[PDB]
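Hey Z.,

So I finally got round to the 3O8 thing we talked about over coffee. Here's the setup:
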Amino acid sequence: PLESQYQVGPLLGSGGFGSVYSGIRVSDNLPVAIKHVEKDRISDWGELPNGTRVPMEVVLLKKVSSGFSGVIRLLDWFERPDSFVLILERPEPVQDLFDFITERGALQEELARSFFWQVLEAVRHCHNCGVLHRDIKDENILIDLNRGELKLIDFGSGALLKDTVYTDFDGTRVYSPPEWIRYHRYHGRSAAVWSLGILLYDMVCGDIPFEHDEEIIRGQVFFRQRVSSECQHLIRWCLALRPSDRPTFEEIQNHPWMQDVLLPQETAEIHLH
Ligand SMILES: Nc1ccc(NCCNCCO)c2c1C(=O)c1c(O)ccc(O)c1C2=O
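And the result:
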C-alpha cells in the first residue's frame, strides 16, 4: 500500500539520516516528505505502546507529533525488508536554515530573534513530551517561507529525555558541549542549551564559532560581525564551560535580547516576502 498511496517526486536530500524525497499523498494532494532509513544503519531501536520493534526515531516522533508545534510531524510509517520508510509533513515552499544562512549571510537580529524564539518553543515542546533531540543545528531546521514558521526535523540521534547522565552521542561534534569532548558525559538539557548557543552565534554571524576540539574546550567566543552587547551576552551565557553556569530555557526566554519578538507571520512579511 505504500507506492499506491503516495506519489514520489525529487530527492530532497541524503546523508547520515538516509534519503528523503518529496512526495504527495494521493488521497488529497498533501505535500509530504518520504524518508527512507536502512535497517543496517539503525544503531538504536525502541518499541511502541502496542509493542513492535522500530527505530527510536519513530518512537520519538510519535511522542512529539501530537497537536501543533514547531516539530515536523510523522504522518505514517512503513516497514520493508531492509528499510523503514517515514511519511512526514512537508511545508511548501520551504528552505532549510543552513541554506538560508548560506544564501543571505548573517541574519539581522530581529529575524534571528524570531527564529531563535521559535526554536526554543519547539525544543521545549520536545522536552515536554519526554524527547531529547540531541542534534539541534541549522540543517535540522526548516523554514516555511510563507508563514515564517520554523520546524525541527531530524530525530535520528535523539533519545528519551532522562535526568541522569548520557554517555553516548551521535549528533554533530562542532555543536557538542565541552563536557562531552572532555569526559564523554553530559546531561540533556544543559547540552541542549550549549547547542542553542552555537545555533544563535551561527545565525547572527553566518558561521559556527568553533571548529576544533581545543576551541570547544577553551570556550572563548570571538565576533567577526557587529553584534549587540546583549545578543553577545546571551550567546556567551549558553556557551558557559560549566554546565551549571548555563541558562535554563526559562532564563533564555526572559533574557533582555529575547523581548518583543515578532510573530511568525510578520516575520515572513518583513524578512521573507
Ligand atoms: N534534508 C532536507 C533538505 C531539504 C529540504 N527542503 C528543500 C527545499 N529547497 C530549499 C533547500 O533547503 C528538506 C529536507 C528534509 O530532510 C525534510 C525532512 O527530513 C522532512 C520534511 C521535509 O519537508 C524536509 C525538507 O523539506
